[PDB]
């Protein structure tokens, strides 16, 4: 039930997502090992992901959270990078997309820094890099990230290194 609609580079929505993408690139403590060496991206395409069933599943949970938390869903737009991006866009997030070894427990992880999610695009630790050149820093091959809507509700604050 998923369809993908291309945004034009002329569209303000293309431009604002490109800007979140470009402006939240940071350097990473691995020197670019997981995700590659870059300061910016060549954005080739931005598509809106439309799936009614998945959307309603999201908004239902959002309301339950809100009502347990003085009417505050505490919703954010966050990046997600995953080898399972094709399954996620078609079937939604579930336990199969969880980071079992994540530092805050087996759950599904999102990032404010696009460059952080870029590290997971080819797998945890960047896997073996791109399918074609086996290069975690490939400048030729095309990559995909998700920019996602996330409900945090009452978030347990964990201070951490």
């Amino acid at each position: 039930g998923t369809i993908l609609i291309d945004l034009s580079p002329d569209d303000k929505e293309f431009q604002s997502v490109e800007e979140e993408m470009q402006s939240t690139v940071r350097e990473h403590r691995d020197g670019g090992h997981a995700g590659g060496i870059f300061n910016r991206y060549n954005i080739l395409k931005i598509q809106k992901v439309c799936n009614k069933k998945l959307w309603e599943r999201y908004t239902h949970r959002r309301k339950e959270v809100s009502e347990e938390n003085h009417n505050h869903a505490n919703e954010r737009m966050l990046f997600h990078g995953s080898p399972f991006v094709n399954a996620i866009i078609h079937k939604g997030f579930d336990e199969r997309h969880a980071y079992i070894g994540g530092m805050f427990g087996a759950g599904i992880y999102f990032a404010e820094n696009s460059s952080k999610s870029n590290q997971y695009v080819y797998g945890i630790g960047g896997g073996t890099g791109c399918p074609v050149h086996k290069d975690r820093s490939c400048y030729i091959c095309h990559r995909q990230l998700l920019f996602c809507r996330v409900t945090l509700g009452k978030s347990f604050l964990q201070f951490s290194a």
Partner: protein, 47 residues
């Protein structure tokens, strides 16, 4: 998948060392996220 801490709906990982790192977040239910944009890109070799 684990559970949220009792009385909470997610975990926020507040960066407490790398001054430039933004926050990271964890949910324990797939239903608390929707994948709104698919961005196709290349990283660019610095000049």
């Amino acid at each position: 998948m684990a559970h949220s801490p009792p009385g909470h709906h997610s975990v926020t990982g507040r960066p407490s060392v790398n001054g430039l790192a933004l926050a990271e977040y964890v949910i324990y239910r797939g239903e608390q996220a929707y994948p709104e944009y698919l961005i196709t890109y290349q990283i660019m070799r610095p000049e």
